Design an enzyme around this catalytic site. Structure first.
Site, PDB file in Angstrom:
ATOM      1  N   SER A 138     101.242  -6.642  18.079  1.00  0.00           N
ATOM      2  CA  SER A 138     100.275  -5.782  17.385  1.00  0.00           C
ATOM      3  C   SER A 138      99.645  -4.853  18.400  1.00  0.00           C
ATOM      4  CB  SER A 138      99.183  -6.590  16.690  1.00  0.00           C
ATOM      5  OG  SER A 138      98.198  -5.721  16.152  1.00  0.00           O
ATOM      6  N   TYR A 154      93.443 -13.686  17.184  1.00  0.00           N
ATOM      7  CA  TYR A 154      94.560 -12.791  16.926  1.00  0.00           C
ATOM      8  C   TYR A 154      94.940 -11.974  18.156  1.00  0.00           C
ATOM      9  CZ  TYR A 154      97.429  -9.540  14.161  1.00  0.00           C
ATOM     10  OH  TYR A 154      98.460  -8.791  13.628  1.00  0.00           O
TER      11      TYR A 154
HETATM   12  N1  LIG Z   1      98.773  -3.978   9.437  1.00  0.00           N
HETATM   13  C1  LIG Z   1      99.846  -4.991   9.557  1.00  0.00           C
HETATM   14  O1  LIG Z   1     100.429  -5.416   8.525  1.00  0.00           O
HETATM   15  C2  LIG Z   1     100.229  -5.507  10.928  1.00  0.00           C
HETATM   16  C3  LIG Z   1     100.941  -6.679  11.033  1.00  0.00           C
HETATM   17  N2  LIG Z   1     101.270  -7.167  12.288  1.00  0.00           N
HETATM   18  C4  LIG Z   1     102.038  -8.342  12.421  1.00  0.00           C
HETATM   19  O2  LIG Z   1     103.245  -8.103  11.579  1.00  0.00           O
HETATM   20  C5  LIG Z   1     103.775  -9.449  11.363  1.00  0.00           C
HETATM   21  C6  LIG Z   1     104.196  -9.540   9.938  1.00  0.00           C
HETATM   22  O3  LIG Z   1     103.050  -9.586   9.083  1.00  0.00           O
HETATM   23  P1  LIG Z   1     102.914  -8.687   7.731  1.00  0.00           P
HETATM   24  O4  LIG Z   1     104.271  -8.068   7.360  1.00  0.00           O
HETATM   25  O5  LIG Z   1     101.873  -7.611   7.953  1.00  0.00           O
HETATM   26  O6  LIG Z   1     102.296  -9.704   6.652  1.00  0.00           O
HETATM   27  P2  LIG Z   1     103.025 -10.485   5.512  1.00  0.00           P
HETATM   28  O7  LIG Z   1     102.152 -11.613   5.109  1.00  0.00           O
HETATM   29  O8  LIG Z   1     103.338  -9.485   4.367  1.00  0.00           O
HETATM   30  O9  LIG Z   1     104.426 -11.022   5.992  1.00  0.00           O
HETATM   31  C7  LIG Z   1     104.444 -12.135   6.821  1.00  0.00           C
HETATM   32  C8  LIG Z   1     105.362 -13.147   6.295  1.00  0.00           C
HETATM   33  O10 LIG Z   1     105.430 -14.197   7.305  1.00  0.00           O
HETATM   34  C9  LIG Z   1     105.247 -15.437   6.566  1.00  0.00           C
HETATM   35  N3  LIG Z   1     104.654 -16.471   7.359  1.00  0.00           N
HETATM   36  C10 LIG Z   1     103.346 -16.666   7.682  1.00  0.00           C
HETATM   37  N4  LIG Z   1     103.209 -17.771   8.416  1.00  0.00           N
HETATM   38  C11 LIG Z   1     104.437 -18.346   8.584  1.00  0.00           C
HETATM   39  C12 LIG Z   1     104.914 -19.479   9.232  1.00  0.00           C
HETATM   40  N5  LIG Z   1     104.014 -20.335   9.901  1.00  0.00           N
HETATM   41  N6  LIG Z   1     106.244 -19.757   9.201  1.00  0.00           N
HETATM   42  C13 LIG Z   1     107.115 -18.940   8.551  1.00  0.00           C
HETATM   43  N7  LIG Z   1     106.689 -17.833   7.901  1.00  0.00           N
HETATM   44  C14 LIG Z   1     105.371 -17.519   7.908  1.00  0.00           C
HETATM   45  C15 LIG Z   1     104.438 -15.080   5.415  1.00  0.00           C
HETATM   46  O11 LIG Z   1     104.604 -16.036   4.348  1.00  0.00           O
HETATM   47  C16 LIG Z   1     104.880 -13.755   5.056  1.00  0.00           C
HETATM   48  O12 LIG Z   1     105.914 -13.771   4.079  1.00  0.00           O
HETATM   49  C17 LIG Z   1     102.721 -10.395  11.765  1.00  0.00           C
HETATM   50  O13 LIG Z   1     103.110 -11.018  13.013  1.00  0.00           O
HETATM   51  C18 LIG Z   1     101.528  -9.594  11.934  1.00  0.00           C
HETATM   52  O14 LIG Z   1     100.591 -10.164  12.860  1.00  0.00           O
HETATM   53  C19 LIG Z   1     100.936  -6.448  13.408  1.00  0.00           C
HETATM   54  C20 LIG Z   1     100.231  -5.269  13.306  1.00  0.00           C
HETATM   55  C21 LIG Z   1      99.887  -4.793  12.051  1.00  0.00           C
HETATM   56  C1  LIG Z   2      96.200  -4.927   7.750  1.00  0.00           C
HETATM   57  O1  LIG Z   2      96.001  -6.253   8.107  1.00  0.00           O
HETATM   58  C2  LIG Z   2      95.779  -6.669   9.406  1.00  0.00           C
HETATM   59  C3  LIG Z   2      96.372  -6.017  10.475  1.00  0.00           C
HETATM   60  C4  LIG Z   2      96.130  -6.427  11.776  1.00  0.00           C
HETATM   61  C5  LIG Z   2      96.843  -5.673  12.858  1.00  0.00           C
HETATM   62  O2  LIG Z   2      97.340  -6.575  13.766  1.00  0.00           O
HETATM   63  C6  LIG Z   2      96.134  -4.607  13.649  1.00  0.00           C
HETATM   64  C7  LIG Z   2      96.807  -3.295  13.380  1.00  0.00           C
HETATM   65  O3  LIG Z   2      97.547  -2.825  14.440  1.00  0.00           O
HETATM   66  O4  LIG Z   2      94.758  -4.471  13.486  1.00  0.00           O
HETATM   67  C8  LIG Z   2      94.077  -3.565  14.308  1.00  0.00           C
HETATM   68  C9  LIG Z   2      94.657  -3.060  15.471  1.00  0.00           C
HETATM   69  C10 LIG Z   2      93.985  -2.154  16.277  1.00  0.00           C
HETATM   70  C11 LIG Z   2      92.714  -1.736  15.930  1.00  0.00           C
HETATM   71  C12 LIG Z   2      92.126  -2.223  14.778  1.00  0.00           C
HETATM   72  C13 LIG Z   2      92.800  -3.132  13.970  1.00  0.00           C
HETATM   73  O5  LIG Z   2      92.201  -3.603  12.831  1.00  0.00           O
HETATM   74  C14 LIG Z   2      90.984  -4.244  12.910  1.00  0.00           C
HETATM   75  C15 LIG Z   2      95.328  -7.533  12.021  1.00  0.00           C
HETATM   76  C16 LIG Z   2      94.736  -8.193  10.951  1.00  0.00           C
HETATM   77  C17 LIG Z   2      94.963  -7.762   9.650  1.00  0.00           C
HETATM   78  O6  LIG Z   2      94.375  -8.416   8.595  1.00  0.00           O
END
Ligand SMILES: NC(=O)C1=CN([C@@H]2O[C@H](COP(=O)(O)OP(=O)(O)OC[C@H]3O[C@@H](n4cnc5c(N)ncnc54)[C@H](O)[C@@H]3O)[C@@H](O)[C@H]2O)C=CC1
Ligand SMILES: COc1cc([C@H](O)[C@@H](CO)Oc2ccccc2OC)ccc1O
Ligand SMILES: NC(=O)C1=CN([C@@H]2O[C@H](COP(=O)(O)OP(=O)(O)OC[C@H]3O[C@@H](n4cnc5c(N)ncnc54)[C@H](O)[C@@H]3O)[C@@H](O)[C@H]2O)C=CC1
Ligand SMILES: [Mg+2]
Lengths: 273, 273
Positions: free
Chosen positions: A144, A158
């Protein structure tokens, strides 16, 4: 590396970014294994590809990336059913944020287990086979920008884990290179996803004694903004990174100046050599 | 904050950097609690301060910073026996390095337990009391420049943990400031110490199934270079950081350009906002 004819193993592959990556790798000729802790997400994802008659090229496995036994079994199952994998996407993650004084050891253990030990477990369980099969491969770890730009205490767990994932990816590069395995760390800004459902995704063993249930409740009600990036756009960035062996992928530039100021402060703490 | 009259709790305080910090904090009027896993180190430290007629102001506790029960005990013992602490130095660390393909889950768990969970356990066990007593305080976490400058795979476990400690310290700053507790992350380059004894310091439960015993045995034979920095010089840097509430302290400038190159590569990955 060419994506056509590969198998990709994608944690958190059934929602958000992981699903966006799944769609785009499939579109580029990869077969998929989607690994996810949410059975309903997995079913939805399976139905999605079946509606497009791609169900043959997609396999689903329900697991917790922080369970090493399940990850070892999943490595065997991937190879047996779909082959490989050639491409390892350690993307699953959750949001363990909340008032810092309210966080308990259970919250720290949860946050680090999923967001830091998940990727480590993926590397440990899958890369021995990737080396042995001797046809190269690629690893993508989803960190992230919160791992790079200064963050507030509300997001301590986080940010701490995500910073570690960036460094993890940097350091393993030369080892993986020995066997023609490239690595990428993906650092997104805001992407449309279902991470607001993180409370639902918290493994059972981390629930009792948590101090952040109230925050998880509020998070569950957060509206996904229409100006956040689409997962398929992130997917295309990852296709590009895999093809061209790019170490770093950032999805947004909005924290360039805040990162610069952090970097400057770090350099300024250094005496003259 | 003013150091005179305070009590400082220092993990790894009986050797190397921690002992240098111990000496300079005592010189500036603090009483000491040295917490260390090595009884012989503790005894040596005791004799050192006894020979200098300062023994009454130094208490020793043998513990493993990755044992949360022992850390809770230590918080009670510190407060009861020496007061406070007002200054918390999460400094203990070990060297878990070795050929990356040889590292096992035990090596990951060991490296993260001591170098990342040690400081977290310190924060969790000690800062509630520091807030409660209401006279402010300070936290120093010892990371490394290896958490910042690019590192090879041989040092993956170490680098990953140390990067996390840097971010941990940044993120907790605003929370700790609520109660007039300042924070510092110390990032050293080469300091004269006994970290080459890390094999001896590995807790028992991480020994069986390690893949790096041979590396630890080689490490034990490494000679400490005469041109490495003295721990007391680092100690004085930390005195300044506590007095002036400095977020970052780096002991060496030798990795300025390698850090700059890393930072530039990170920034270059970011699109136009
Ligand atoms: N604004 C955003 O959506 C951002 C997301 N991230 C990272 O992107 C990655 C993907 O998250 P998103 O697509 O945003 O959310 P999301 O919740 O839509 O997708 C994540 C998926 O991983 C699954 N998951 C959660 N815990 C698990 C576990 N212990 N074992 C197996 N599967 C598991 C969830 O059930 C879900 O289907 C995460 O690592 C998150 O921290 C990073 C920056 C920004
Ligand atoms: C949109 O959802 C999330 C998304 C993040 C992301 O990891 C990052 C996005 O890159 O959150 C931030 C990163 C940098 C500055 C501010 C952010 O949000 C507080 C963390 C927690 C969340 O619930
Ligand atoms: N060149 C150097 O010496 C550098 C050291 N560091 C860091 O400085 C810190 C201090 O290490 P040094 O002074 O160099 O080595 P050191 O080995 O001389 O001192 C560390 C002390 O911590 C103790 N210790 C180790 N594991 C412990 C545990 N689980 N519980 C309680 N105590 C434990 C040791 O017994 C030892 O007395 C470490 O965090 C290290 O990673 C960082 C960069 C450079
Ligand atoms: Mg005891």
């Amino acid at each position: 590396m060419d994506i056509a004819g590969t198998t990709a193993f994608i944690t958190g592959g059934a929602s958000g970014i992981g699903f966006g990556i799944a769609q785009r790798l499939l579109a580029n000729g990869a077969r998929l294994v989607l690994a996810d802790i949410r059975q309903d997400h997995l079913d939805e994802a399976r139905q999605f590809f079946e509606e497009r008659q791609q169900g043959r090229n997609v396999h689903t496995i329900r697991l917790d990336v922080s369970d090493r036994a399940q990850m070892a079994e999943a490595a065997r199952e991937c190879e047996a059913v779909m082959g490989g994998p050639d491409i390892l996407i350690n993307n699953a993650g959750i949001d363990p944020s909340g008032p810092f004084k309210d966080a308990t050891y259970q919250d720290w253990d949860y946050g680090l287990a999923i967001n830091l030990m998940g990727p480590i477990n993926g590397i440990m369980a899958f890369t021995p086979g990737m080396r042995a099969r001797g046809r190269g491969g690629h690893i993508v770890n989803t960190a992230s920008l919160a791992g790079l730009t200064p963050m507030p205490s509300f997001m301590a767990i986080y940010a701490t884990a995500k910073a570690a994932v960036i460094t993890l990816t940097e350091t393993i590069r030369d080892s993986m290179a020995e066997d023609n395995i490239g690595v990428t760390v993906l650092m997104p800004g805001p992407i449309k996803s279902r991470i607001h459902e993180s409370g639902q995704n918290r493994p059972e063993r981390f629930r009792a004694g948590s101090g952040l249930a109230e925050t998880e409740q509020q998070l569950a009600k957060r509206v996904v903004a229409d100006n956040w990036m689409e997962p398929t756009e992130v997917g295309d960035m990852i296709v590009d990174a895999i093809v061209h062996n790019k170490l770093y992928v950032s999805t947004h530039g909005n924290w360039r100046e805040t990162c610069e100021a952090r970097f400057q402060a770090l350099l300024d703490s250094m005496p003259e050599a």
